[PDB]
Amino acid sequence: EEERLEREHFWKIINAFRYYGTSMHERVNRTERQFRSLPANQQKLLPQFLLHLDKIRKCIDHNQEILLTIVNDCIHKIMPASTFDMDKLKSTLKQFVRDWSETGKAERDACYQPIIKEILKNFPKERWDPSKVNILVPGAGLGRLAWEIAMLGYACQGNEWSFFMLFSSNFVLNRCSEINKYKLYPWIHQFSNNRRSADQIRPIFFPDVDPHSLPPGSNFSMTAGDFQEIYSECNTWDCIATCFFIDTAHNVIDYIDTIWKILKPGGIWINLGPLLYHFENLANELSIELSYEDIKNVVLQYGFKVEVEKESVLSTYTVNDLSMMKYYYECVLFVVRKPQ
Amino acid sequence: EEEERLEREHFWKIINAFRYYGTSMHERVNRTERQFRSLPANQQKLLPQFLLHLDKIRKCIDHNQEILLTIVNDCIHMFENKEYGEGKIMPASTFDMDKLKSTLKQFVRDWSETGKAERDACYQPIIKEILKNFPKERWDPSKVNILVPGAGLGRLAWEIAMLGYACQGNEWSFFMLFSSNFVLNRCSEINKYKLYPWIHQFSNNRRSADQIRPIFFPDVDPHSLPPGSNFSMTAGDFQEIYSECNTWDCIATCFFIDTAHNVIDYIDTIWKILKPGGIWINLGPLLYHFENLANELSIELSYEDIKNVVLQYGFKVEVEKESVLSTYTVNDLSMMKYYYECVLFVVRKPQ
Numbered sequence: 203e204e205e206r207l208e209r210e211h212f213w214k215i216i217n218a219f220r221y222y223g224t225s226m227h228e229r230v231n232r233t234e235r236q237f238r239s240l241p242a243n244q245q246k247l248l249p250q251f252l253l254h255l256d257k258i259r260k261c262i263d264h265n266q267e268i269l270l271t272i273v274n275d276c277i278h279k280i281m282p283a284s285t286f287d288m289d290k291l292k293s294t295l296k297q298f299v300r301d302w303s304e305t306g307k308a309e310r311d312a313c314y315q316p317i318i319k320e321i322l323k324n325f326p327k328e329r330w331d332p333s334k335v336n337i338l339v340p341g342a343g344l345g346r347l348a349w350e351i352a353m354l355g356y357a358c359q360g361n362e363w364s365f366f367m368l369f370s371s372n373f374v375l376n377r378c379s380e381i382n383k384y385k386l387y388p389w390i391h392q393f394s395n396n397r398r399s400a401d402q403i404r405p406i407f408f409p410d411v412d413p414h415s416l417p418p419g420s421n422f423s424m425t426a427g428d429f430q431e432i433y434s435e436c437n438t439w440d441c442i443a444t445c446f447f448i449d450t451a452h453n454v455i456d457y458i459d460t461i462w463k464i465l466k467p468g469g470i471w472i473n474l475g476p477l478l479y480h481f482e483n484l485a486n487e488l489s490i491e492l493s494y495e496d497i498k499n500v501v502l503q504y505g506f507k508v509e510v511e512k513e514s515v516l517s518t519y520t521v522n523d524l525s526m527m528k529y530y531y532e533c534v535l536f537v538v539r540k541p542q
Numbered sequence: 543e544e545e546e547r548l549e550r551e552h553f554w555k556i557i558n559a560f561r562y563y564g565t566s567m568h569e570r571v572n573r574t575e576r577q578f579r580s581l582p583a584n585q586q587k588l589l590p591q592f593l594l595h596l597d598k599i600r601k602c603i604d605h606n607q608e609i610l611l612t613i614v615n616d617c618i619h620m621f622e623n624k625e626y627g628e629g630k631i632m633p634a635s636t637f638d639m640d641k642l643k644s645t646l647k648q649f650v651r652d653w654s655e656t657g658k659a660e661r662d663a664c665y666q667p668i669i670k671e672i673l674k675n676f677p678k679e680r681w682d683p684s685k686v687n688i689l690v691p692g693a694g695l696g697r698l699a700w701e702i703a704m705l706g707y708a709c710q711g712n713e714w715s716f717f718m719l720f721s722s723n724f725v726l727n728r729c730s731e732i733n734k735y736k737l738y739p740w741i742h743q744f745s746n747n748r749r750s751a752d753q754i755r756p757i758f759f760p761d762v763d764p765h766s767l768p769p770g771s772n773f774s775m776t777a778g779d780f781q782e783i784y785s786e787c788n789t790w791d792c793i794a795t796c797f798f799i800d801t802a803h804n805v806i807d808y809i810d811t812i813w814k815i816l817k818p819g820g821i822w823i824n825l826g827p828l829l830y831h832f833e834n835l836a837n838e839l840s841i842e843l844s845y846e847d848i849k850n851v852v853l854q855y856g857f858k859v860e861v862e863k864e865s866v867l868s869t870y871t872v873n874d875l876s877m878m879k880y881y882y883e884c885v886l887f888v889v890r891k892p893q
């Protein structure tokens with residue numbers, strides 16, 4: 203039963219990838235119908251408006267071809283997908299920017315470089331054979347952070363639950379070599395807050411780096427499924443690196459429990475992120491929202507020793523740099539050690 | 543005669559929403575407690591202050607409800623609203639509860655010392671342009687007519703009136719009108735009131751105390767307008783109220799033109815009602831309030847298109863600055879913040 207319900211969920215996501223163009227063409231048709239409803243004197247003020255909609259339509263069609271390339275390369279009547287899933291699909295396109303485009307570099311350096319520096323600090327070659335250091339990256343997203351860690355020689359495993367992320371990371375990590383071969387239009391659905399009409403249809407390219415350039419003897423892998431269910435072996439991991447991850451929990455205390463169980467004595471958990479609880483005030487969903495002060499008190503009561511704590515680490519997440527409206531986070535970075 | 547009744551129906555709908563705040567917020571907190579109480583007992587024992595913290599939030603909810611009932615009491619007994627009448631007790635919608643939460647945050651932006659930094663980024667650039675174009679050496683400020691559409695809680699219109707200009711604020715939303723009538727007419731003592739504008743945010747809290755911290759208002763006495771000043775506020779749609787052409791020396795729009803169903807209609811109204819030689823000062827982003835909503839018209843223009851439309855009307859561009867950084871009802875202690883790269887422009891209707 204559970205295995206087939208997963209197959210039902212599997213096809214539900216395949217269908218969403220295939221419904222992208224339909225969903226976006228309908229949104230552009232709404233904008234076009236409203237423009238044509240305007241008095242002719244106002245339409246005449248904007249002689250490029252309908253042409254610009256045609257450029258958006260071309261970008262939609264291109265994005266849809268990328269999405270089909272992803273869906274085809276992970277297999278070997280399109281029914282209307284839901285609004286929840288089309289939003290997750292739009293976020294997935296933006297994820298290619300953060301994880302695999304030059305455009306996403308400044309974001310990666312704010313989020314990933316502090317984690318990588320702490321791994322290098324705690325697992326130096328003077329003390330460890332890196333190939334024997336087992337590092338787990340739960341909620342690895344499109345896999346760039348786990349990839350960076352494996353590029354250093356550590357045995358790194360990323361884990362991911364979302365098929366949106368697994369289909370896409372499978373494509374980038376296994377069907378991509380040629381730097382910047384591919385092109386996406388990730389901002390075409392934002393019609394607000396554009397300085398210039400061109401900003402909305404601008405492309406991004408990926409991958410900025412060759413994913414098949416892992417060193418000889420690298421140990422990189424990716425698992426599919428609920429982090430809290432896949433990882434049952436206690437005292438297994440040297441290091442767990444969570445990035446924008448622990449606020450995805452129905453109950454973050456369970457995440458902390460799992461991380462404690464599966465770390466080796468002496469192992470470390472590195473965390474960087476905010477506390478945007480993903481199930482907060484969502485209909486009929488468990489969500490325990492803790493302040494950072496409460497999370498620290500749970501961590502201390504568990505027995506972790508605090509080795510690093512920085513608050514107010516500024517970063518963005520899939521930010522559109524040209525947008526007239528932007529979000530940023532004052533993340534917390536901490537490194538805690540399971541006592542040996 | 544049908545507007546007379548759909549407006550009345552809307553008025554009591556907003557009153558009822560103000561009265562429903564406590565019920566709504568208390569339900570949210572009761573959901574939090576129920577979910578906490580269903581965790582394993584050993585996890586509950588890791589947080590021995592959690593239930594007491596919910597109790598502090600519940601006290602903040604009651605205090606907020608008291609402020610909202612004071613606003614209600616003030617506007618029900620306002621002579622101007624006798625046309626609205628005096629038998630249903632419906633629960634309010636989620637949309638209106640969201641508008642109530644935004645309304646509490648506006649008090650921070652417009653009438654609290656906590657909001658001073660935000661005001662100085664949005665309101666000072668507008669005010670400097672007014673002083674620049676109607677300097678005291680050459681203009682009797684009391685004969686300069688300045689319209690502030692979408693005035694919200696009114697702080698900007700008030701600041702302009704404080705300088706001596708004949709300033710009128712305009713606002714459509716009953717949430718803003720009820721609250722601004724209360725602040726501008728009844729809050730005559732600095733920092734006498736407080737409210738708890740952040741208690742609804744359970745995410746991105748550094749310390750639990752941050753969620754329940756108060757803000758005080760008003761930071762200035764709104765009745766410290768000097769003798770000779772000329773300050774007023776109108777109720778209703780900017781496009782329907784102002785139909786006389788060639789009336790205003792200056793129109794000042796702050797975080798406003800992106801509320802339009804069709805921003806071209808706003809631009810057209812502004813051009814008609816300015817005196818020849820008058821100026822339109824604008825500062826804000828382009829967050830179109832009706833974008834992608836079923837059965838709502840929304841024309842989303844890039845800033846480039848807005849400037850092109852403005853130029854085609856015959857406005858002359860005198861000031862243009864992009865990337866004017868500002869926040870909007872920002873929670874300074876939150877771990878997640880939004881900001882805007884606004885455009886400031888000053889355009890002149892040719893004489």
Ligand SMILES: Nc1ncnc2c1ncn2[C@@H]1O[C@H](C[C@@H](N)CC[C@H](N)C(=O)O)[C@@H](O)[C@H]1O
Pocket residue numbers: 300340341342343344361362363364367427428429430445446447450451
């Ligand atoms: N229980 C879970 N097990 C595995 N993955 C999860 C789980 N919960 C959430 N996720 C994924 O965690 C990721 C959270 C992302 N915000 C972060 C992605 C990535 N770490 C990044 O910084 O870009 C999402 O991709 C989720 O699909």
Ligand SMILES: Nc1ncnc2c1ncn2[C@@H]1O[C@H](C[C@@H](N)CC[C@H](N)C(=O)O)[C@@H](O)[C@H]1O
Pocket residue numbers: 651691692693694695712713714715718778779780781796797798801802
């Ligand atoms: N057609 C309209 N006529 C009058 N007021 C409007 C209209 N459309 C939107 N508003 C109000 O414009 C205001 C927009 C606010 N974002 C800005 C308020 C204020 N200018 C501030 O900067 O704090 C809201 O209070 C709206 O209720």
Ligand SMILES: NCCC(=O)N[C@@H](Cc1c[nH]cn1)C(=O)O
Pocket residue numbers: 446447449450475476477478519520521528529530
């Ligand atoms: N302005 C962009 C903000 C954004 O996309 N946050 C994401 C990712 C996130 C935030 N905390 C943990 N994961 C989301 O909402 O899921």
Ligand SMILES: NCCC(=O)N[C@@H](Cc1c[nH]cn1)C(=O)O
Pocket residue numbers: 797798800801826827828829870871872879880881
């Ligand atoms: N980060 C807080 C954001 C916020 O409240 N923005 C207002 C802003 C706005 C933009 N133009 C007119 N008003 C809204 O969405 O109504």
Ligand SMILES: [Ca+2]
Pocket residue numbers: 593597
């Ligand atoms: Ca109690």
Ligand SMILES: [Ca+2]
Pocket residue numbers: 730731763765
């Ligand atoms: Ca007084």
